[PDB]
Design a protein around this nucleic acid. Structure first.
Ligand code: 1N7
Ligand code: MG
Lengths: 66, 552, 1316
DNA sequence: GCGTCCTTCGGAAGAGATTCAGA
DNA sequence: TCTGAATCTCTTCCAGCACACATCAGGACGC
RNA sequence: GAUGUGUGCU
């Protein structure tokens, strides 16, 4: 379901900002998860250009530079 | 933060830290005093409880509270929940260069313009004013320019008109359901305090004008202005992202104007006359020589791009009205004439705009939308389509149907005491016969309302579609439906109880006659449930969209 | 007949149904409840007396010392209401109580006492309630709304449906006391009864059964009736009750006296039961194997060794029955455990219960209530005695016991406040019976199960809490006290009681700020029935049922007035005639119906008594005697509407208006509106602002009189007389001699309330409506308050509307207001607002109020005086200086941005210790002069009246009027007269004169001391200056303007006079609405009001035309009589033949602007009457007229509606909502812009707007939205410099709210960090 | 006046802990 | 008497923006 | 700054 399919994403920041922050942060801290700032909510939170629209070109350049 | 007086703010993290440090210092003191193991064990337990309260208060059985039994917020209480650092200060932030005021119509605008108050754009575009004043040398430093602006001299208005010339602003309504709730308009300075808004985009904003406010935001950087103009400008948001239907569709007054203009009755000031063009039709109507609802044969030239993008004209002589001929004058070259030669409701106008967008493009569509709005407002004002109390005509065969239905109800009630029918099927059939009477009354009403208008052909009488204003704005699709007209002129219906039991005696009175002291109380159950459903059940529908956005 | 306030402008009434009960005092709940709380009760049941006798007399820990209450007294308030509002202190009264500490002699508990010490001791400080039911707490006026909470008693709910996830509906029995813990009984899906004290955890009801000192055999005796088995020769015959075998399967061949009755396995029919009863037999046979599934009732022990063979609640097995057969126990007891009727629930609970004795049951209860503590016998015993059987820790009130006894069908109504064995046993028996099938649950939305706690009851509870808090210390301190030195004040602390009462009245969920912007708002705020607050439910856990309107709200609670939003249906308003029962429930008036005559005596039936009688309908036709003309009338018997005969009825409704509230009874043609639109109309009528010149509504309801008079904003005359002197700020009434008392007669003075600030920053300003030398009668309006016209609630103006689309300037719901409306200042209102400039003493020194400000020239300091305070009457605009305050190194008070004003009041409060500033002492001197002058003037006027009374005594019994004038004024009381009672009256009047002299002298001294006082303030402030601006907010495009039928709108264009449409007479149209707002939202009442107002204005225009050209009284009288006799059959029936041929002329002069029409709520004016009234003038019967366009000058090619609709002006003004923010102030914990318009704050870019920005793909716009004009600090300043550098470029960093998040996560045990 | 200090009451769903029963 | 299936218990969630007003910040005890 | 109340538009 759309709740579990959002809680069980790869980037723990999205799941932490969506719902059940304690249960997500605890599991991420135990497992030592490593975020990648892949989607849109993570970049919105951090304060970067989203890899969605006019920032998609910038994100593509950033990914292809490494 | 120190307030007025010697006391301090009711901080909760500091209070929890005070408790934890106090307990820790007490435990350290008791470790050296060689206290009995029971006392130091109890103090260690209290320290553990205090730390568990500091980390996530309330996760244990009972939460601690500071004053008046209000559970104070720990570290987790300001990271989780709706009032945490994620959903309140990171995913959504308070924003500079923003404004807020009530909105009005101002239909003189264009699709790409809004009206900012002259005393608000001065506050929004203030650093731009400082920069241009320093560029022109009228000021010397930021302080001098700031003082000059706040003093509102005679030239700061002449500078504000240069920073705002082609600098779009973002008008956002409060519930931003879909992406069309934020659009960009080129400002037009007006005297006043209300943000004027183009009437077409009200459908997208879902913004009436009964006291709601909109927020205006200023794109600062160059890229923001170019995104506001190329992506978020209202002229680039004529198509709904949900479906291929147009979203800037005339609503409830342009529709009524174009429905009154593009409609014919079988009589006229001048009927059989033959016209030589739409311009001559407008000249004929504005001169008072022929009514707007004549039945004439005007000679028109409808272009067509049936070739590979080439406009080839074809002129003919079609049997139309004067109003349709007037309206055709604003249709762009490229549309067939079998698009205004009817009674334009709201679906007709929406399909007209859709076909214009698919055929001509975007710029002719915007021009066509503006012209449609103008010519709808003008010929709706020139019609005086009021609503009186004689327009809601109750059908004469209403109390007869009521008497027949009540006689049947009395017969079934008497049969109930005879034992033939129990409190089951009898209730079912009495509800069904009341519904039968309801549909018969509504059908009689809607047959007396529209086709029952005898007009003279000048040879004899015949019928037509009614000019009854209630029916006019119900048929045009401006505002209303079958339910509202049924509840105004027919009977109201069967208002059930909140549990689900349909009331045995349906309301036989409408809002053209009175309502009894008891029928109103019956209707209040449904009205209160319909009002409460919105208030306390839009929360789940607004949580569904949040889940859908976060999953995708 | 009519009085002078009625024979001045008499409103035509269209009500057909005659009235029998006049609308009562509308705010009769607040005043009556606080009168009950505050009065002196000898017996003591209400308010303080009951609260004192509940706690007092108080005794120590057997210390031979008692403190006993005797009597209480309320001292006079320190300041009056006006001085409290001006100053900012509560309007309260001291609480003086004659406490008495008594100590008996040593070794003599009941002997003679050592001494009697008593003194009136000041404890607590109870706020008093003003004349209008409003308190004053800190100058601001509060209103304590009533509360609608579930009554104490027992409520057998159901918990239907969703429990158990299988469809089995449980049953629960909650015992709610007024004060104390709960006693929730409830069932289990396995048919087990679980007691639940305070919702802690489930446990079998056998635990509390044993806790009540009961054995198992006693439990089985209580809940089950025994079935007798007798051991005999053999075969174990059974004692049989014939009724028991009803509805089951015959387990064997049912026989008696040889013959066979029911065969094997046959379901026993009632015919067989009746025939067995008629057989008159009691004993039959039964197979032994059948008793394998039975239970024993009582314990059974051996007769030889005493060993137990069958304990109580044990099964009968074949081996066990065989053992019992040889034992010698011939009579066997078993239970009537039917599987459908008499379910064996409590036996199963006994089986589940692990406890066996009372002591262990008490231990288990102690462990449940207070876990983790060592249970002892005495501690558990005391806990269980304090739970449900102690008069201090548990108290069902009188209403609680009434509901408890009525729900159990008992006979007595009174009883003890604590529970008992029989109470809990009866509750459990009733619950079991409901489970069985007999009886039914009771819904908790029924208005017979919801009480009303007004101000008096809540204040009594809160005071009792403080009294308990004080008496605990009075008990502890008394045992450790030195006698002969403890007068009854050293042990009672006044801090707790005063603190608790102030905590209630000041900061509570029901001590709401008074919504005060017109008389309707306050009069509907006082009559407000809330459900939130203490002891009620929150809007989070508020179900779909509490919001919904119950059928029992008819006549008690308004159905169509509840505030929309988060709390809809929880804040219902009281009905018009609704009253408060003695217990607190809601009851409504009803006309008693005899055999065939609808009588006049009126009975107030509650919500539980109504559900038994058959009550007729208000709109039922009668014929001069009280008889129903038709045989079948519509009625409501048991919450259900049906047709009933003319003989089954026994009650009839009083009037049609009794269903709706006061606020919703002002809407004309309410029955033609939708209910949502009626709700919106009521709310917006509550939100209306008072305009400059109040204008009467042409179409009304007749309820405006009651709302105006009974609100308290208008000065209503106390005793009838003649206006001796009418002034713009004072009215003097010379009372008629029949209304004068013998002693202390004089006259009465009404001091009007001039321009002063309301709670919502509006203006309340009473102005006279009577002329000089005009005879007034008792109980009539003397001066109209805000938004009133001759004692008639007038919230708006009669605007000449026309429903037509006009060039799109009324596109969606907008209004197009003509410029004549703003030229005439019909909607321009006043907004007095106060601006304070406090002067604290921070570090480096205090702050001064000097007029010299550094770095500011004299141009800005021109308005101020030499003392730094602005002159009264300055035309100060936005940005000027009001008070010049300097901070030790400028922080002077400045008028806010974009607001004009005119200072009309400056009040300076200086804390004691500072001598003064010269402006403050000038204000003090002016106040001293005014307080001397007004008192001297009132004394002069009332003594002129007193000397007139002296002379009127002198004219009887030897008057010498020839020598009367020449006498000097002093020597008039002792002129020539006989020694009859006339000389007694003269001496009494002289005594009154001398006493008034002394009283005026001491009052003047007290006034001197009060004005010259020290005016204590907050800790750490020197002086406070309050400046009262006064703006005239004109009408402008943007502010909401609304009608009464829920048709609001925002003005989009102030169109010039010439552009407005005009009729053939050239008269313009003041407002152009939108027609399309009528059919979709079916508020058809606006169009009917438009037509009726058009008819009324036509009548007014005919009167004005016949009055402009001078015409005699004959034509005017004839036309006005024709106008007032228009209806088919109305109860108005006013005849002008009794008017004195000048009163008709004044009436015509008052009617020339339009005849006011009364259209009662559900007794309204029919369309035929409207059309006939229109035809009475020269207006078309269809209502619509021909309108010509104002610009093109050509006719609109359709007749359009033109009439006079009553437009309000809601105070959602555009200038209070316009706001913008550039780079300004930012928050502290996270570097974000502040929130709100008060501080310079920016609009929140919410979580939903970020999604809309992501959808477009606008990344740079979003990036600037959440970094550069937001949390970022360095990037923000760099962006500001770039913007004022000619460069539109951003260099964002990272929002500071993310660093805050990182630090707050790292403050836990987590370690989150960025990776390179 | 300053100043130092140790109630209860929703409901829907889901997860994760206990208990049943049955082969 | 091991182990799926059912049941009991504890946790999480319940819209968006805005405006107005008020109250609070330790109060109990020593001096 | 946090609570409490009232209110506006959905
Ligand atoms: C005797 C009188 C009725 C006259 C017959 C009974 C019936 C209802 C009783 C009141 C209610 O319980 C509410 C309230 C409970 C609190 O405890 C404070 C007292 C209150 C006022 C009670 C006093 C008294 O007991 C009342 C008036
Ligand atoms: Mg709206």
């Amino acid at each position: 379901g759309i709740t579990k399919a959002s809680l069980a994403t790869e980037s723990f920041i999205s799941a932490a900002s969506f719902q059940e922050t304690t249960r997500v942060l605890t599991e991420a801290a135990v497992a030592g998860k490593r975020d990648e700032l892949r989607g849109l909510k993570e970049n919105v939170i951090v304060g970067r250009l989203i890899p969605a629209g006019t920032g998609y070109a910038y994100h593509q350049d950033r990914m292809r530079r490494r | 933060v120190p307030l007025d007086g010697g006391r301090f703010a009711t901080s909760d993290l500091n209070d929890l830290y005070r408790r934890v440090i106090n307990r820790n210092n007490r435990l350290k003191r008791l470790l050296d005093l060689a206290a009995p193991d029971i006392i130091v064990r109890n103090e260690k337990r209290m320290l553990q409880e205090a730390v568990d309260a500091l980390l996530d208060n309330g996760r244990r059985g009972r939460a601690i509270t500071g004053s008046n039994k209000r559970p104070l917020k720990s570290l987790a209480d300001m990271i989780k929940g709706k009032q945490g650092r994620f959903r309140q200060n990171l995913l959504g932030k308070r924003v500079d260069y923003s404004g807020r005021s009530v909105i009005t119509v101002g239909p003189y605008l264009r699709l790409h313009q809004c009206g900012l108050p002259k005393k608000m754009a001065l506050e929004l575009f203030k650093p731009f004013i400082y920069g241009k004043l320093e560029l022109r040398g009228l000021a010397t430093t930021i302080k001098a320019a700031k003082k000059m602006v706040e003093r509102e001299e005679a030239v700061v208005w002449d500078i504000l008109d240069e920073v705002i010339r082609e600098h779009p602003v973002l008008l956002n309504r409060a519930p931003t359901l879909h992406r069309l709730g934020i659009q960009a308009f080129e400002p037009v300075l007006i005297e006043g305090k209300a943000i004027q808004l183009h009437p077409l985009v009200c459908a997208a904003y879902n913004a009436d004008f009964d006291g709601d406010q909109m927020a205006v935001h200023v794109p600062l950087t160059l890229e923001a202005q170019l995104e506001a103009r190329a992506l978020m400008m209202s002229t680039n948001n004529i198509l709904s992202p949900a479906n291929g239907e147009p979203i800037i569709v005339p609503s409830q007054d342009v529709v009524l104007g174009l429905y009154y203009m593009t409609r014919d009755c079988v009589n006229a000031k001048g009927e059989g006359m033959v016209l030589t063009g739409p311009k001559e039709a407008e000249r004929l109507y504005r001169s008072g020589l022929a009514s707007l609802h004549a039945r004439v044969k005007v000679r028109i030239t409808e272009y067509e791009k049936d070739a590979n993008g080439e406009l080839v004209a074809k002129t003919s002589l079609k049997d139309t009205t004067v109003g349709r001929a007037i309206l055709w004058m604003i249709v762009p070259k490229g549309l067939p004439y079998s698009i205004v030669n009817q009674a334009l409701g709201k679906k007709a106008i929406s399909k007209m705009l859709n076909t214009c967008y698919r055929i001509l493009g975007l710029k002719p569509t915007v021009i066509f939308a503006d012209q449609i709005m103008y010519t709808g407002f003008a010929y709706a004002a020139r019609s005086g389509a009021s609503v009186g109390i004689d327009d809601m005509v109750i059908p004469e065969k209403k109390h007869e149907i009521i008497s027949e239905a009540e006689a049947e109800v009395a017969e079934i009630q008497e049969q109930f005491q005879s034992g033939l029918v129990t409190a089951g099927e009898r209730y079912n059939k009495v509800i069904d016969i009341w519904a039968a009477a309801n549909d018969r009354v509504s059908k009689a009403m809607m047959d007396n309302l529209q086709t029952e208008t005898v007009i003279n052909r000048d040879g004899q009488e015949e019928k037509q579609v009614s000019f009854n204003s209630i029916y006019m704005m119900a048929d045009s699709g401006a505002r209303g439906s079958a339910a509202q007209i049924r509840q105004l002129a027919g009977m109201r219906g069967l208002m059930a109880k909140p549990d689900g039991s349909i009331i045995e005696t349906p309301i036989t009175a409408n809002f053209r006659e009175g309502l009894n002291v008891l029928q109103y109380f019956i209707s209040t159950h449904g009205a209160r449930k319909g009002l409460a459903d919105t208030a306390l059940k839009t929360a789940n529908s607004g949580y569904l969209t949040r889940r859908l956005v976060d999953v995708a | 007949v009519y009085s002078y306030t009625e024979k001045k402008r008499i409103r035509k009434d269209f009500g057909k149904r005659p009235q029998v009960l006049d609308v009562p005092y509308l705010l009769s709940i607040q005043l009556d409840s606080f009168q009950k709380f505050i009065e002196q009760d000898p017996e003591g049941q209400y308010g303080l007396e009951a609260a004192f006798r509940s706690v007092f007399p108080i005794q120590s820990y057997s210390g031979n010392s008692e403190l006993q209450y005797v009597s209480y007294r309320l001292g006079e308030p320190v300041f009056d209401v006006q001085e409290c509002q001006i100053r900012g202190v509560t309007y309260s009264a001291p609480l003086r109580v004659k406490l008495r500490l008594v100590i008996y002699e040593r070794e003599a508990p009941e002997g003679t006492v050592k001494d009697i010490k008593e003194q009136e001791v000041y404890m607590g400080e109870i706020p008093l309630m003003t004349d209008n039911g409003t308190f004053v707490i800190n100058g601001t006026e509060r209103v304590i709304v009533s509360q609608l909470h579930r009554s104490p008693g027992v409520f057998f709910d159901s918990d239907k449906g969703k429990t158990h996830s299988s469809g089995k509906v449980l049953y629960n029995a909650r015992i709610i006391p007024y004060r104390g813990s709960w006693l929730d009984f409830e069932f289990d899906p396995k048919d087990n009864l679980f007691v639940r004290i305070d919702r802690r955890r489930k446990l079998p009801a056998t635990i509390i059964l044993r806790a009540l000192n009961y054995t198992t055999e006693q439990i089985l005796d209580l809940f089950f009736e025994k079935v007798i088995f007798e051991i005999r020769d053999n075969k174990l015959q059974m004692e049989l009750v014939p009724e028991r075998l009803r509805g089951e399967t015959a387990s064997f061949d049912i026989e008696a006296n040889g013959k066979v009755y029911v065969e094997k396995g046959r379901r026993i029919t009632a015919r067989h039961i009746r025939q067995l009863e008629k057989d008159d037999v009691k004993l039959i046979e039964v197979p032994v194997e059948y008793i394998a599934g039975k239970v024993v009732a009582k314990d059974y022990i051996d007769e030889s060794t005493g060993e137990l063979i069958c304990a109580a609640n044990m099964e009968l097995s074949l081996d066990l029955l065989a053992k019992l057969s040889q034992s010698g126990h011939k009579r066997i007891e078993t239970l009537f455990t039917n599987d459908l009727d008499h379910g064996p629930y409590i036996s199963e609970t006994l089986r589940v219960d692990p406890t066996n004795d009372r002591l262990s049951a008490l231990v288990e209860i102690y462990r449940m209530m207070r876990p983790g503590e060592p249970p002892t016998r005495e501690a558990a015993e005391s806990l269980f005695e304090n739970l449900f059987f102690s008069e201090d820790r548990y108290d069902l009130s009188a209403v609680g016991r009434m509901k408890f006894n009525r729900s159990l069908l008992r006979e007595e109504i009174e009883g003890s406040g604590i529970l008992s064995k029989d109470d809990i046993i009866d509750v459990m028996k009733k619950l079991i019976d409901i489970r069985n099938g007999k009886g039914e649950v009771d819904d908790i939305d029924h208005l017979g199960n919801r009480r009303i706690r007004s101000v008096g009851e809540m204040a009594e509870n809160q005071f009792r809490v403080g009294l308990v808090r004080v008496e605990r210390a009075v008990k502890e301190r008394l045992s450790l006290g030195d006698l002969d030195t403890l007068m009854p004040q050293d042990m009672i602390n006044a801090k707790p009681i005063s603190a608790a009462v102030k905590e209630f009245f000041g900061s509570s969920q029901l001590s709401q700020f008074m919504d005060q912007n017109n008389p309707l708002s306050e009069i509907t705020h006082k009559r407000r029935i809330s459900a939130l607050g203490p002891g009620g439910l929150t809007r989070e856990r508020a179900g779909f049922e509490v919001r919904d309107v119950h059928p029992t709200h008819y006549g008690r609670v308004c159905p169509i007035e509840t505030p929309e939003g988060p709390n809809i249906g929880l804040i219902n308003s009281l009905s018009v005639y609704a009253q408060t029962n003695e217990y607190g429930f809601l009851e409504t008036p009803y006309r008693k119906v005899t055999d065939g005559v609808v009588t006049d005596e009126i009975h107030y039936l509650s919500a539980i008594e109504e559900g038994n009688y058959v009550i007729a309908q208000a709109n039922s036709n009668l014929d001069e005697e009280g008889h129903f003309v038709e045989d079948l009338v519509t009625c409501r018997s048991k919450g259900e509407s049906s047709l009933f005969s003319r003989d089954q009825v026994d009650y009839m409704d009083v009037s049609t208006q009794q269903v709706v509230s006061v606020g919703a009874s002002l809407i004309p043609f309410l029955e033609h509106d939708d209910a949502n639109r009626a709700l919106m109309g009521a709310n917006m009528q509550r939100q209306a602002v008072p305009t400059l010149r109040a204008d009467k509504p042409l179409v009304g309801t007749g309820m405006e009189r009651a709302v105006a008079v009974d609100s308290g904003v208008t000065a209503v005359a106390k005793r009838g007389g003649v206006v001796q002197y009418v002034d713009a700020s004072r009215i003097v009434i010379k009372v008629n001699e029949d209304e004068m008392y013998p002693g202390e007669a004089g006259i009465d003075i009404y001091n009007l309330t001039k321009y002063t600030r309301s709670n919502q920053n509006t203006c309340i300003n009473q102005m006279p409506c009577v002329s000089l030398g005009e005879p007034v009668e008792r109980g009539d309006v003397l001066a109209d308050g805000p938004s009133t016209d001759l004692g008639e609630l007038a919230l708006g103006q009669n605007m000449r509307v026309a429903f037509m689309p006009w060039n799109g300037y009324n596109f969606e719901d907008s209004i197009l207001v003509s410029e004549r409306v703003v030229q005439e200042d019909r909607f321009t209102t006043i907004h007095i607002q106060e601006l304070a400039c406090v002067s604290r003493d921070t570090k480096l020194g205090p702050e001064e109020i000097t007029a010299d400000i550094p770095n500011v020239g004299e141009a800005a300091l021109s308005k101020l005086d030499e003392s730094g305070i602005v002159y009264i009457g300055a035309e100060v605009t936005g940005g000027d200086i009001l008070v010049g305050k300097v901070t030790p190194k400028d922080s002077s008070l400045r008028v806010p941005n974009g607001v004009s004003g005119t200072v009309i009041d400056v009040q300076v409060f200086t804390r004691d210790g500072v001598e003064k500033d010269k402006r403050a002492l000038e204000i003090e001197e002016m106040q001293l002069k005014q307080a001397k002058k007004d008192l001297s003037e009132e004394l002069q006027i009332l003594e002129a009246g007193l000397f007139s009374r002296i002379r009127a005594v002198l004219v009887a019994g030897g008057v010498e009027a020839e020598k009367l004038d020449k006498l000097p004024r002093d020597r008039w009381l002792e002129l020539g007269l006989t020694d009859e009672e006339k000389q007694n009256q003269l001496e009494q009047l002289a005594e009154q004169y001398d006493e008034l002299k002394h009283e005026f002298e001491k009052k003047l001294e007290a006034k001197r001391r009060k004005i010259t006082q020290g005016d204590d303030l907050a800790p750490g402030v020197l002086k406070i200056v309050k400046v009262y601006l006064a703006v005239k907010r004109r009408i402008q495009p943007g502010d909401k303007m609304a009608g009464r039928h829920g048709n609001k709108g925002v003005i989009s264009k102030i169109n010039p006079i010439e552009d407005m449409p005009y009729d053939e007479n050239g008269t313009p149209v003041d407002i152009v609405l939108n027609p399309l707002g009528v059919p979709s939202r079916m508020n058809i009442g606006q169009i009917l009001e438009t037509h009726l107002g058009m008819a009324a204005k036509g009548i007014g225009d005919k009167i004005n035309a016949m009055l402009k050209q001078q015409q005699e009284v004959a034509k005017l009288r004839e036309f006005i009589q024709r106008a007032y006799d228009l209806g088919a059959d109305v109860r108005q029936k006013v005849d002008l033949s009794t008017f004195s041929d000048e009163e008709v002329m004044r009436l015509a002069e008052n009617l020339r602007k339009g005849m006011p029409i009364a259209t009662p709520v559900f007794d309204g004016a029919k369309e035929a009457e409207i059309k006939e009234l229109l035809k009475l003038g020269d207006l078309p019967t269809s209502g619509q007229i021909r309108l010509y366009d104002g610009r093109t000058g050509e006719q609109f090619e359709r007749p359009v509606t033109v009439g006079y609709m009553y437009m309000l002006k809601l105070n959602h003004l555009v200038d209070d909502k316009m706001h913008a923010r550039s780079t300004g102030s930012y928050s502290l914990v996270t570097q974000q812009p502040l929130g709100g318009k008060a501080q310079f704050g920016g609009q929140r870019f919410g979580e939903m707007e970020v999604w809309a920005l992501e959808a477009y793909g606008a990344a740079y716009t979003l990036q600037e939205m959440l970094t550069v004009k937001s949390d970022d600090v360095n990037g923000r300043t760099k962006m500001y410099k770039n913007i004022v550098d000619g460069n539109h470029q951003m260099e964002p960093g990272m929002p500071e709210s993310f660093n805050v998040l990182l630090k707050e996560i790292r403050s836990l045990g987590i370690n989150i960090e960025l990776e390179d």
